[PDB]
Amino acid sequence: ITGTSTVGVGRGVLGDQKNINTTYSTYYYLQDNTRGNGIFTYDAKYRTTLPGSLWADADNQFFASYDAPAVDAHYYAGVTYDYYKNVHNRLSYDGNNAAIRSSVHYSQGYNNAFWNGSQMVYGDGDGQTFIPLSGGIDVVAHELTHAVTDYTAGLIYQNESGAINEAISDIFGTLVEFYANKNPDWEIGEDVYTPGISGDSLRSMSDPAKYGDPDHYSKRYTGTQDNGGVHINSGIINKAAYLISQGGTHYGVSVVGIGRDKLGKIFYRALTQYLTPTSNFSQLRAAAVQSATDLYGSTSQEVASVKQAFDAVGVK
Numbered sequence: 001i002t003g004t005s006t007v008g009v010g011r012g013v014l015g016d017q018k019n020i021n022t023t024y025s026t027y028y029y030l031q032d033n034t035r036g037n038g039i040f041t042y043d044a045k046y047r048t049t050l051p052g053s054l055w056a057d058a059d060n061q062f063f064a065s066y067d068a069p070a071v072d073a074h075y076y077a078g079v080t081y082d083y084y085k086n087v088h089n090r091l092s093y094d095g096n097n098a099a100i101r102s103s104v105h106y107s108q109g110y111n112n113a114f115w116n117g118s119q120m121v122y123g124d125g126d127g128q129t130f131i132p133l134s135g136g137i138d139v140v141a142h143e144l145t146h147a148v149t150d151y152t153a154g155l156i157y158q159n160e161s162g163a164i165n166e167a168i169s170d171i172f173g174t175l176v177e178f179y180a181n182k183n184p185d186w187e188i189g190e191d192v193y194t195p196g197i198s199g200d201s202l203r204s205m206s207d208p209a210k211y212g213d214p215d216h217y218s219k220r221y222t223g224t225q226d227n228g229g230v231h232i233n234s235g236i237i238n239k240a241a242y243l244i245s246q247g248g249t250h251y252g253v254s255v256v257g258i259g260r261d262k263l264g265k266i267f268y269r270a271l272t273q274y275l276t277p278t279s280n281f282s283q284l285r286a287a288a289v290q291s292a293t294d295l296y297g298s299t300s301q302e303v304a305s306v307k308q309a310f311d312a313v314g315v316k
């Protein structure tokens, strides 16, 4: 809608207070005009028709329980917008400031979130396995990053290309988390996962095997489940990215870490300039080596570490 740009206040899923960019026209809407062609959040009202209703509030204050997922989907979309623009000089997910839209309160007890080709969708969780998934900034940035992949490399959501797709979403999810720098880690979804159990996570990049995911190519899954294991074999690439950033010795292979920022520069370049819809793990290593080479030179530590990292996950 057309309206006056305002700033509201409320708290998130985790009970934290934050300010949000709203739009005033009789009601206050969760529409942020300060980033690109807008960030828009909607109420799916526990149903599954999308996107639902543009979120409207009478007084611009968002402290109801019902408000919380909305507040966070809105806010972390903006943080995710800010990462791509400031860090990668990318304007929204399509690179031309496309409107970002999210729907929350999707279905009943929906233990998931996703990108559906046009927008982000977040369930509320069943309150046991999950709380409203928008509470995790790594979850939000994972979702939007799927959007980024779909407009760039277009990695098909199956087999190795699919695991690459997922891994990219986990890698940038994580980088954005470190970027907002609120308790960041190399784990996935911990803020909104299993409310009753501290310390766990949906997935781990540092040690994917923690949750039954492979950290070596020889342990790769090749059944037909989970689209040929896009959420399973992603661990092999996640581990690799973890290693490039952080370093370590994995199955006897030592990797010199080069930190988060260069990891992000190297994978963003691979994603946008080298990867394609059918790239496999092998092509990804080549893409990453070329990227690192592009960025730091053929004889750099960066190229070397990239190689070490894929070597360690058994990817040639």
Ligand SMILES: [Ca+2]
Pocket (backbone or CB within 6 Å): 057, 058, 059, 060, 061, 062, 063
């Ligand atoms: Ca209100």
Ligand SMILES: [Ca+2]
Pocket (backbone or CB within 6 Å): 177, 182, 183, 184, 185, 190, 191
């Ligand atoms: Ca965290």
Ligand SMILES: [Ca+2]
Pocket (backbone or CB within 6 Å): 138, 174, 177, 184, 185, 186, 187, 188, 189, 190
């Ligand atoms: Ca995390």
Ligand SMILES: [Ca+2]
Pocket (backbone or CB within 6 Å): 190, 192, 193, 194, 195, 196, 197, 198, 199, 200, 201
């Ligand atoms: Ca938990």
Ligand SMILES: [Zn+2]
Pocket (backbone or CB within 6 Å): 142, 146, 166, 169
């Ligand atoms: Zn995903």
